[PDB]
Nucleic acid binder design. Structure first.
Ligand SMILES: [Mg+2]
Length: 276
DNA sequence: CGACGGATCC
DNA sequence: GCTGATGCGC
DNA sequence: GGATCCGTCGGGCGCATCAGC
């Protein structure tokens, strides 16, 4: 139950200082996270790119605080066409990307505001809020098709330029990514279909878990803890937030941090360092 | 989705 | 048009 | 009696719908 994140390695194995800092954070309501002081933490983090998930807020009700973010002025937003207070993603950046696409191509999937795709010269960054399987595993059939369609979309992106996937992938790949792995082997987040889903995505694009490459056998490292009861205090949680990287980016990986003590959601912020 | 408790092995 | 009471996804 | 395994339940968030003024 013990997890204090290691210190920030800001250099590469080749001695190269980190040039890039990406942050990803499911904000369980942008309008409820800004009031509980998350933009302040993001200002103490100084990310070059901030990727926000479950914003549940449309651009028209976008809080005004976003326009007082000085090193994060390029701001791209997605939302569901039908649902309000559902999903919603964000990409705030210091540099203006060459291209900002939204979605994954399959119109069926490009509806709930779950994917922003930003291209830069060295790399394409894709933020995401992957769909749940459901209480009762209802939309689990949907997830499996959605997965084939994201792994195929991202393989063709990685065909052109090195790829960094980040965000809430809604899956604990292995038993080290969750505290109670047996009580949830049939529950949402830890179904065998989705676990195999993750592994197929790692091999197909291909991709590597930024955290499990650097910390291969490090347990108790979680990114989400239920509001039911006091799971974050007894550290009962899951690792659903990740930094998936192209293999051609493992040489530039300095660190993948899980900022556990950053509050304001049911999720904690994850931060990446890269010498690119 | 963790708390909980039953329903089974030793 | 406000403002609490209740779904809904989770 | 417990170790374990597995099913059953019910209830913290944010938002936002719409009842009842
Ligand atoms: Mg959520």
């Amino acid at each position: 139950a013990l997890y204090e994140d290691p210190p920030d390695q800001k250099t590469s194995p080749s001695g190269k200082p980190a040039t890039l800092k990406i942050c990803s954070w499911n904000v369980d309501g942008l309008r409820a996270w800004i009031k509980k002081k998350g933009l302040d933490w993001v200002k103490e983090e100084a990310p070059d790119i901030l990727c926000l998930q479950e914003t549940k807020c449309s651009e028209n009700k976008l809080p005004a605080e976003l326009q007082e973010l000085p090193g994060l002025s390029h701001q791209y937003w997605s939302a569901p066409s039908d649902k309000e207070g559902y999903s919603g993603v964000g990409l705030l950046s210091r540099q203006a990307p060459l291209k900002v696409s939204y979605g994954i191509g399959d119109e069926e999937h490009d509806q709930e505001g779950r994917v922003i795709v930003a291209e830069f010269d060295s790399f394409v960054l894709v933020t995401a809020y992957v769909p749940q399987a459901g209480r009762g595993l209802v939309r689990l059939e949907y997830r499996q098709r959605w997965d084939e369609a994201f792994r195929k979309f991202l393989k063709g992106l990685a065909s052109r330029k090195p790829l960094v996937l980040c965000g809430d992938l809604n899956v604990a790949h292995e038993e080290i990514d969750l505290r109670n792995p047996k009580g949830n082997k049939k529950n949402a987040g830890f179904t065998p279909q989705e676990r195999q889903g993750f592994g197929e995505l790692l091999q197909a694009v291909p991709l590597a878990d930024s955290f499990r490459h650097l910390y291969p056998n490090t347990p108790y490292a979680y990114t989400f803890w239920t509001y039911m009861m006091n799971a974050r205090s007894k550290n009962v949680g899951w690792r659903l937030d990740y930094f998936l990287l192209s293999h051609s980016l493992l040489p530039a990986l300095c660190d993948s941090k899980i900022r556990s003590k950053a509050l304001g959601s049911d999720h904690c912020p994850i931060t990446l360092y890269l010498a690119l």
